[PDB]
Amino acid sequence: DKAKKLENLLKLLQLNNDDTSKFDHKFWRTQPVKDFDEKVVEEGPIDKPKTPEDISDKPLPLLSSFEWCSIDVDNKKQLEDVFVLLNENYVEDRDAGFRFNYTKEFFNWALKSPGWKKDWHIGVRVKETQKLVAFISAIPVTLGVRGKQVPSVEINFLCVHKQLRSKRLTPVLIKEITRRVNKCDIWHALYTAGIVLPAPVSTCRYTHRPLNWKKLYEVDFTGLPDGHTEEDMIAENALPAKTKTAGLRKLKKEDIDQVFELFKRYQSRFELIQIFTKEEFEHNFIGEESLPLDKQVIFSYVVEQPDGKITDFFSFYSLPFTILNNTKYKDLGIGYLYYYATDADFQFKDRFDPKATKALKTRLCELIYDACILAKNANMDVFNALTSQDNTLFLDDLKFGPGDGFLNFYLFNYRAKPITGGLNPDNSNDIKRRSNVGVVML
Numbered sequence: 001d002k003a004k005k006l007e008n009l010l011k012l013l014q015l016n017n018d019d020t021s022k023f024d025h026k027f028w029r030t031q032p033v034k035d036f037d038e039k040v041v042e043e044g045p046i047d048k049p050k051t052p053e054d055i056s057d058k059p060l061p062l063l064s065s066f067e068w069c070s071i072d073v074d075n076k077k078q079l080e081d082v083f084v085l086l087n088e089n090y091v092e093d094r095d096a097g098f099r100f101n102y103t104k105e106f107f108n109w110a111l112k113s114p115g116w117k118k119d120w121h122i123g124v125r126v127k128e129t130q131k132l133v134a135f136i137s138a139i140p141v142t143l144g145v146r147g148k149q150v151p152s153v154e155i156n157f158l159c160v161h162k163q164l165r166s167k168r169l170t171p172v173l174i175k176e177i178t179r180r181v182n183k184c185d186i187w188h189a190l191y192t193a194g195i196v197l198p199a200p201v202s203t204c205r206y207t208h209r210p211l212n213w214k215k216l217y218e219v220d221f222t223g224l225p226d227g228h229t230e231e232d233m234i235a236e237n238a239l240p241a242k243t244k245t246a247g248l249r250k251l252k253k254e255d256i257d258q259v260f261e262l263f264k265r266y267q268s269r270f271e272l273i274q275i276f277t278k279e280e281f282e283h284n285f286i287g288e289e290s291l292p293l294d295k296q297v298i299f300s301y302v303v304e305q306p307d308g309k310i311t312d313f314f315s316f317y318s319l320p321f322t323i324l325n326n327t328k329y330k331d332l333g334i335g336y337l338y339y340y341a342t343d344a345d346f347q348f349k350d351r352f353d354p355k356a357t358k359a360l361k362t363r364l365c366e367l368i369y370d371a372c373i374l375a376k377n378a379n380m381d382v383f384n385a386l387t388s389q390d391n392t393l394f395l396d397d398l399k400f401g402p403g404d405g406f407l408n409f410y411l412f413n414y415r416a417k418p419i420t421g422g423l424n425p426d427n428s429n430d431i432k433r434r435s436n437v438g439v440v441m442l
């Protein structure tokens with residue numbers, strides 16, 4: 001009642017002409033989640049503490065015709081099954097012009113994270129045919145939620161085949177993967193969606209830096225502004241071929257220890273983060289051995305000083321679209337800004353000091369300017385960033401356009417207060433406060 005009131009208001013805040021994928025609440029009403037009207041007095045779990053023994057080993061009943069299944073990443077045939085199911089179904093509109101293009105290379109990187117368990121890469125198949133019709137994945141991480149060590153799981157890649165959509169099969173998937181994670185002494189999750197569900201702990205906005213404006217326009221992924229020319233836009237978004245900041249090079253393995261310190265030192269300013277083990281850190285920021293440029297997933301760069309000191313670190317991952325109804329172009333290169341760290345504001349006591357901000361800003365501008373060059377050179381056509389972290393320092397100056405897509409962050413079975421998503425009351429970039437959202441989901 002005051003739940004629906006505040007939900008409609010939340011939906012109105014986020015109203016737009018769904019860009020990409022975007023889908024009274026009988027399922028979540030029965031779930032360990034913050035409700036909209038609920039003010040949080042103290043942060044912590046929602047359910048009374050439990051043990052694996054209160055949770056059964058028998059998987060939840062599916063309707064007649066279906067069956068569960070693990071997916072072994074390493075098993076080509078099975079892996080392929082996932083990205084076929086995704087690519088064909090992961091975009092609402094069938095004739096939208098674009099399709100997701102999840103590669104084997106990509107899921108090998110994302111789904112094989114330290115502690116990954118094939119039983120957490122869940123699927124559903126038709127009994128008779130063995131057709132994979134639904135998928136959800138879980139991966140282990142300890143989250144940092146305002147100083148508190150939360151041992152949790154990251155749910156991503158929920159997908160249900162379009163032909164049997166709206167069949168309340170999503171609850172079953174969720175319950176079942178909750179079951180499998182509860183049965184291993186994990187009681188929380190971090191999930192993000194573009195859709196508004198009961199527990200938005202945060203909200204950020206997608207933005208786009210054009211790297212190849214001409215192609216972007218020819219594919220209808222960007223507009224031609226009023227009183228402006230095609231050439232004008234080309235000229236406006238023109239990037240140099242070579243990066244500008246001295247010291248810049250790829251992230252070698254030998255850098256892990258020095259970077260990992262700089263990263264958790266830097267990251268420890270945000271209220272919601274993932275606490276990285278040197279193991280999982282190394283896995284995220286160095287991809288499969290020698291992939292070609294059109295298959296490489298994670299791009300990580302560092303700034304080495306003459307004396308060998310590592311000062312800065314930024315990363316980005318590729319996730320291409322397939323472009324359908326278009327004679328000139330078959331696909332669209334998409335870079336996403338990932339995790340980064342810099343020591344440029346370290347010699348300052350307060351993050352929000354006008355001087356500490358000025359310093360951090362002109363550095364982030366330098367680094368992310370180069371990230372763009374690098375991405376363009378990696379043959380990407382557009383560069384996405386999320387108003388999260390300290391992103392709001394450079395988004396505008398670096399010609400990151402406003403993008404009509406919102407990302408809400410959620411915590412399962414845990415209540416936390418609103419965390420700055422880098423947005424103002426009116427959805428413009430909060431350049432004064434920036435964001436305390438430290439995690440970057442896929």
Ligand SMILES: CCCCCCCCCCCCCC(=O)SCCNC(=O)CCNC(=O)[C@@H](O)C(C)(C)COP(=O)(O)OP(=O)(O)OC[C@H]1O[C@@H](n2cnc3c(N)ncnc32)[C@H](O)[C@@H]1OP(=O)(O)O
Pocket residue numbers: 021022023024025026027028029089090091092153155156157158159160161164165166167168169170171174177178181182186187188189191192193194195197412
């Ligand atoms: C350690 C404990 C474990 C923690 C577990 C964490 C669980 C959280 C996991 C959450 C995963 C997020 C992480 C990601 O991967 S977010 C990425 C999800 N991907 C997409 O949305 C792109 C492709 N979309 C689809 O395939 C859709 O058709 C899906 C399958 C998503 C919805 O299917 P459909 O449109 O054909 O209808 P339904 O009959 O199946 O189900 C309708 C009910 O389900 C609720 N719903 C619908 N969509 C979502 C959604 N995206 N997150 C959460 N809930 C969702 C909805 O509110 C309604 O419930 P209620 O409002 O009446 O109550």
